[PDB]
Design a protein around this ligand. Sequence first.
Ligand SMILES: Nc1ncnc2c1ncn2[C@@H]1O[C@H](COP(=O)(O)O)[C@@H](O)[C@H]1O
Ligand SMILES: Nc1ncnc2c1ncn2[C@@H]1O[C@H](COP(=O)(O)O)[C@@H](O)[C@H]1O
Ligand SMILES: Nc1ncnc2c1ncn2[C@@H]1O[C@H](COP(=O)(O)O)[C@@H](O)[C@H]1O
Ligand SMILES: Nc1ncnc2c1ncn2[C@@H]1O[C@H](COP(=O)(O)O)[C@@H](O)[C@H]1O
Ligand SMILES: [Mg+2]
Ligand SMILES: [Mg+2]
Ligand SMILES: [Mg+2]
Ligand SMILES: [Mg+2]
Ligand SMILES: [Mg+2]
Lengths: 153, 153, 149, 157
Amino acid sequence: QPAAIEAFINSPEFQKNIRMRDIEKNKIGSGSYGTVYRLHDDFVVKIPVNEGIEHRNSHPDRVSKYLNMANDDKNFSRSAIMNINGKDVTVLVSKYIQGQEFDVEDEDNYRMAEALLKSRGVYMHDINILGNILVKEGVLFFVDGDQIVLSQE
Amino acid sequence: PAAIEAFINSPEFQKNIRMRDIEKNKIGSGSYGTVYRLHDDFVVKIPVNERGIKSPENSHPDVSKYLNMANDDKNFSRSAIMNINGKDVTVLVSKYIQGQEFDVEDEDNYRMAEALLKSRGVYMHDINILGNILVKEGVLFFVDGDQIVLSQE
Amino acid sequence: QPAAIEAFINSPEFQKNIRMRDIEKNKIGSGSGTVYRLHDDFVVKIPVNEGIRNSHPDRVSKYLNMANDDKNFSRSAIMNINGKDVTVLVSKYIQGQEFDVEDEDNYRMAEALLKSRGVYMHDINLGNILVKEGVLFFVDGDQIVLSQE
Amino acid sequence: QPAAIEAFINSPEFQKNIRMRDIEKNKIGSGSYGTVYRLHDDFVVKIPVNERGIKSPEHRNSHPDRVSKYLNMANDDKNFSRSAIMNINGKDVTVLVSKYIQGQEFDVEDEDNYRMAEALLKSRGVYMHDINILGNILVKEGVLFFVDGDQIVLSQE
Ligand SMILES: Nc1ncnc2c1ncn2[C@@H]1O[C@H](COP(=O)(O)O)[C@@H](O)[C@H]1O
Ligand SMILES: Nc1ncnc2c1ncn2[C@@H]1O[C@H](COP(=O)(O)O)[C@@H](O)[C@H]1O
Ligand SMILES: Nc1ncnc2c1ncn2[C@@H]1O[C@H](COP(=O)(O)O)[C@@H](O)[C@H]1O
Ligand SMILES: Nc1ncnc2c1ncn2[C@@H]1O[C@H](COP(=O)(O)O)[C@@H](O)[C@H]1O
Ligand SMILES: [Mg+2]
Ligand SMILES: [Mg+2]
Ligand SMILES: [Mg+2]
Ligand SMILES: [Mg+2]
Ligand SMILES: [Mg+2]
């Protein structure tokens, strides 16, 4: 039998021609990255539309493989194709997790998440800010931006 | 005697600023806010976007710390108070850098920027493979987001 | 975290009693000592000239490690050559190109990196200090940098 | 009336066709840079002919005209050195002429000595830096490495 996520993906609900406004009520998060929607009780879909469409987590296939590894669960997420406003678009589908953000800045919390990840082959790094890189006469400068992460090592 | 504090303490800076007269100084704008070149050596990022809307939900100016760390320069940037149309607003002041974008899609450039930052105690990463940690009934889950870096090292 | 260079040094290969005849094939550098490649990843400066500033491996290794911001970049070590305990300089082998700092842009970037590592950098264009009956004079030489900036 | 150094440079001893064999006795030092000879009681001449008798960015103190400017400033003495043209074996060669200083190396490793020299140079518009070692710069896949060599000075702080 197919995994639960694959069953959702083959469901008529997922394979229908979707209008962005008809799923506004299922929105749960959006940004320059795209928009996240709870389109089933157990799953969310990240649609690449910038309020819309380098960007964060650019290719669903690679993100999906990283999320599957990080959660040690081969059925956590899938890349898939959805029809959005008459157009075929690659989206990221993953298990919906009902819960609250983990405060990974607290140092014990940090170790817990870090050790768990490492045992699954993933190396975690906090993000302090994002910035852009400028070069002036061979010299690098770091300004407020959004192209790389910069965190205290 | 720091050039950045001098500018902040200058009358040009702490007089009641009104948005109309600096519109010609605008160099960039986005959801985050708007950057103006208010001196030949400094820019100021003001939290009004392209539509003039607008601190929770990591872009608080207090950025200064990490920009100063990234650039290894105590006087690169400040969080400061500027009055806009009669309202004291928290802004970010930085040294103006006239340069080109440094492209870190290029392997060599990325390793060069990375090497520099590491000598400054700063970890650098692409913005791909980023995530958030959710906690559901005690258990840690990893989802698509922008709180942490998920790498395979 | 067993440093690769510590592992190579405390290896038998290195601690072997060595003839100059046996390692000639690994010669890559020469001058007034000679640089040999005895591993895939490390080179060794031996003070045998084309037969013998502040060029003491102890000190050079210290400043190479600071300059590269890498505590494992290099070591001073005892190697035995023709029955003689000799102090040698062992550093990470770097397969690369010469980075031209006559180019101003290149110079500045190398300078900004070194500065972030607490290292001052300069061209070799330099003097020596002499004292003559109490009084200091400065002549052409190589002890200090004389700069106007 | 010209400076002592300029009188030496206009002398027949300096202006003659120089044969290296003839001034071997007046030698005082030699290295990769060239060779220093005492050709007058009061003056030395640095000849850009190496210790192997077989001689621009590659060597230290390459431009004698510029080195001379720096030595004059460092000693606060406009007459301390000159660059000049010498005829050596029928060929014109630019050399560095300096006052001969009969003295001992000043040990800059001692901290009081270091600051004495630093303070004196600073009063003269010259900024001193010690030289811990010399190095070469290598680049490998965009990343700079620093190995044992002689192209740049590397010093702490
Ligand atoms: N699989 C998921 N389950 C639950 N929440 C998720 C999932 N993937 C993403 N999110 C949340 O979606 C939101 C994205 O909206 P935003 O805060 O604007 O980035 C964040 O709260 C994420 O933690
Ligand atoms: N300190 C700075 N010096 C120079 N340019 C800057 C500085 N901070 C931000 N910028 C530029 O401001 C612009 C912001 O517009 P945007 O591309 O919409 O983010 C970009 O071109 C940035 O590179
Ligand atoms: N750690 C190192 N990795 C790679 N090349 C090196 C290293 N140390 C020295 N060299 C090279 O070895 C050679 C020795 O210089 P030479 O004495 O002129 O033969 C030069 O080409 C140096 O750049
Ligand atoms: N003007 C000068 N007066 C006295 N000694 C000098 C003068 N210029 C250079 N020297 C010394 O001449 C020596 C020859 O160079 P070398 O022996 O290779 O270091 C060096 O020790 C210099 O310190
Ligand atoms: Mg931009
Ligand atoms: Mg997020
Ligand atoms: Mg000398
Ligand atoms: Mg000498
Ligand atoms: Mg060499």
